[PDB]
Structure formats: structure tokens, C-alpha cells
Point group: C2
Chain length 251, copies 2
């Protein structure tokens, strides 16, 4: 039994988490673009082209050699135009006091333009306390890295289970998880008020159908197959339909 | 018994690791300043004031709102003037392909100006390969986060032991660890070719409001077997940072001298 996204909108405890479900339902999409292109100019261009097909655009702001102070406002304009959220894949991983400054300040001022960020739990739950200090008043959401797609990683077992307990102690701010196979967690994907987003999706790589329908995730994160396409809008539509149909099979 | 730093120079398998031991003995310091001030202008000023006292200046370049592309050169000039290494505490924690870009590229171009960076092992051992690809040809070194000073952290037990084994497989690049209590590990601090640098250091035990836990210089170096004390707020929130830094230097060096 899977609750439909429309029943989970009312369960989400954070305003960004609620918005994410609302976008998915309105646009019939559970697709996140991993916008791993060479420059900010290419990022804004591909965000505009694939915007109709996505619920979320995932960025690495610290890879862009042409970052400028207006990058965030230009990307926010595109997100508002096409109705998607911006997720900065910053993987915060420091002590609580440091991450406050890495999130709110510096050159990137991530808090001002990213709806969602993610964090590892390795430094302990103080990382959540530090990101929440400036994130929660702004209405932002946090995803915890409970599992990862890379070889030999340590986000497994008791570590994954600890991420679930941290999320449930901080659900004013933690909207969900980065996860790989939450169906195979001891308790499964767990509380439907929290959302799962899964990297490594491709038509190691797993198919949209496997990720959504077999593995119990909620959002597919897709990069290379769209980024490298001759026609990214056309390929993004294919991924949206695959991920959405996989969800509908249960819902 | 522990080896004097000068006797470990010959064991270092990476040139930045070797240089770090050489600086510590030249200057009689095992102090690293965590220069977590509000601006790059203030960072460069404090690095110049405290530089005589330190073997390494640790930065968080992503907290500086006035960062510009001349930062690396300006900080390297101070590092040369006062003979210290630059450690960017970026805590890389992504997959290999992404970390390569976050190290060599973007706006910060960390590889251009940081002698040392650090990485978490949580994403798997491939993170080391990702950073080594462009760091090793430039002679850079890497510290692995085997433990942390923050409350409730997960860098413990089998995770710490895995970081030790990953380091063993990458002696060309991994110069040592961020660690907290290496004397407590099954075989102690381990291979003396590797260095241990410990955050969470203040003259009095205590903590902050967001999970930081502080131990004294003497306990870190002498009791817990580390090699380097990393001190941030203990120095940078002082009215006279240079004088406070000299107090920490003397405590950490004397703690090490007790074992020589």
C-alpha cells in the first residue's frame, strides 16, 4: 500500500516539503534534473528547456566558473516561470556552527535562492540544528543523505537508520531523504510525510520504473541522459512519463 | 614513546606531508589556526598577525562574502612570508566525478592555492581517487576525516577503522587524518608516516551551542596522541589573537616535548 501524493500533501510538516508534493501533483512529474553542465549560462538555458517536465532542478553552484551575484535571482526567475524548486546539492557535512555560515553567507548565499539543500548526518545532529537556524524562518527544507549511489559508501545499515531517526526528530525542517532502495530498509520507505529522492537513474544506474515502483522512492534524479541529449526537452519528457507512470501503477 | 617530528620527515610519502613535518620542527609549532572570521580581508590580516605561530592556516573559503579571484595569491604570499601551509577545510563528500570539479574548478579553484584539503569517507573510497587525479600532480595532500569533535557524530568505531584502511591504500596522497582520540584506536595512532590533526581545542574543556566539544591542547597532544591542534574561536574571538595564539602554541609544543 502506497499513499498517493495527494494524500501526502496534507501530511508534510514543512512549507517547502508541501510545495514539492503540490508541484509533483500539478505537473504530473516526479523528475528532478541533475543540471551538471559546464557553466551557469548553460544551466539557466537547460533549466528553461526542461522546466515543464520537472519538479526540482538540482545544482552544484560551486562547480560553475561563471557564477555571479545575480545567478540565484536568475535561476529563481526560471523556477517561478516553470514552477519547480531549486535544490542545491551542497552535501553540508561540517559542525553546526560552521554550516550556519556556509548556508547563509559567503559568496553563494545558498539560503537566499535554494528551496532545498542536503546534508550528510556524519557530523551528528548538530548539523541539522545549524542549518535550521536560518533555514526554517525562511521556510526552506532539508534532505538528509541516508543512502548513496556510489561504490563502497558507508551510508548503509545502522547509519541509514540513524538518518531516519534524525529526520523524525527534526521534521519541522527535514523534508525527507536522498535514498537508493528505501523499499529494502527494515521498515521500508517509512513515514509518508517524508519524501525520498534517488540519484543514479537512467533508462550504478537503475531504471525509473525500478526506482519508483520496486524500490519505493518518490523522485527520480536524472542527469547524464538528459544533459547530454541532442534534445533535452524531449528526453526529459520521456523520463517524466516513465517516472509518473511507475507511480500511477500503485496510485 | 612516540617519534619526534623530525624523525618522521623521512617517512612521509607525499611532499606536502613531508613539508608539514619540516615546518613544525623549523618553527617549533604544532598549532593550526582555523581562521573562521567574517571576511577574506580579516582572514588575510589575521593570517599575517598569527602566521609566525602556526604550521597551517585552515580556511573555509565558502564563508567569505568578499572572496575574489586574487584571494589565493594573497594568502599564498602570507604563507610564504611566515612559512605555513594552507588547508582548505572543504570536507569533500560527494562522488568522485563531482569532487574533482569542486576541487579544481568553480569560482574558488581550491586546488590552485590550498596545499591541503580534507574529505569524508562516507561516499566511499572513490572520493580519494577523484581528488588525487588533479591534486597529486600538483604535490597536494589530503586529510581523511576519521573522527570529528562534534556531539553525536558517526565517525566512530568501524567507520574510523575504515578511514585508516583507506588511507593505507593511498599513501601517495593521503597525508593523515582529522582525528580526535587516536591513542584510543586498536593499535594507537598507527603509522607515524601519517599525521593527526585535531579540531575541538580550547584552553578549557567546554563546548558551543551547536554540538562542538572542546578538549585542552595538552590532552589532545599528550594524552590522545595527536600531532596538531586546530584552534578557531579560541584565538579569533580574542581581543589579542596573536598573543592568545602564542599561548596555544606553547601548550601544544610543550605537550609534545614531554614525550621527547
Amino acid at each position: 500500500f502506497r499513499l498517493p501524493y495527494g494524500e501526502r500533501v496534507r501530511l508534510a510538516k514543512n512549507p517547502t516539503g508541501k510545495k514539492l508534493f503540490e508541484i509533483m501533483i500539478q505537473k504530473e512529474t516526479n523528475l528532478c534534473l541533475a543540471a551538471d553542465v559546464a557553466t551557469a549560462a548553460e544551466l539557466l538555458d537547460i533549466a528553461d528547456k526542461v522546466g515543464p517536465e520537472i519538479c526540482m532542478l538540482k545544482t552544484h553552484v560551486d562547480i560553475l566558473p561563471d557564477f555571479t551575484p545575480d545567478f540565484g535571482s536568475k535561476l529563481r526567475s526560471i523556477a517561478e516561470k516553470h514552477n519547480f524548486l531549486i535544490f542545491e546539492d551542497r552535501k553540508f557535512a561540517d559542525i553546526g556552527n560552521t554550516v550556519t555560515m556556509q548556508y547563509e553567507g559567503g559568496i553563494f548565499k545558498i539560503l537566499d535562492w535554494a528551496d532545498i539543500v542536503n546534508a550528510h548526518i556524519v557530523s551528528g545532529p548538530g548539523i541539522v540544528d545549524g542549518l535550521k537556524l536560518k533555514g526554517l524562518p525562511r521556510g526552506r527544507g532539508l534532505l538528509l543523505l541516508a543512502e548513496m549511489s556510489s561504490s563502497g559508501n558507508f551510508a548503509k545499515g545502522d547509519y541509514t537508520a540513524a538518518a531516519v531517526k534524525i529526520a523524525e526528530g527534526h521534521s519541522d525542517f527535514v523534508i525527507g531523504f536522498i535514498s537508493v532502495n528505501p523499499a529494502s530498509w527494515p521498515s521500508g520507505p517509512g513515514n509518508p510525510a517524508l519524501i525520498h529522492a534517488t540519484p543514479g537513474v537512467q533508462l550504478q544506474y537503475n531504471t525509473p520504473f525500478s526506482v519508483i515502483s520496486e524500490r519505493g522512492s518518490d523522485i527520480i534524479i536524472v542527469g547524464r541522459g538528459i544533459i547530454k541529449a541532442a534534445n533535452p526537452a524531449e528526453v526529459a519528457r520521456e523520463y517524466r512519463l516513465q517516472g509518473w507512470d511507475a507511480y500511477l501503477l500503485h496510485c
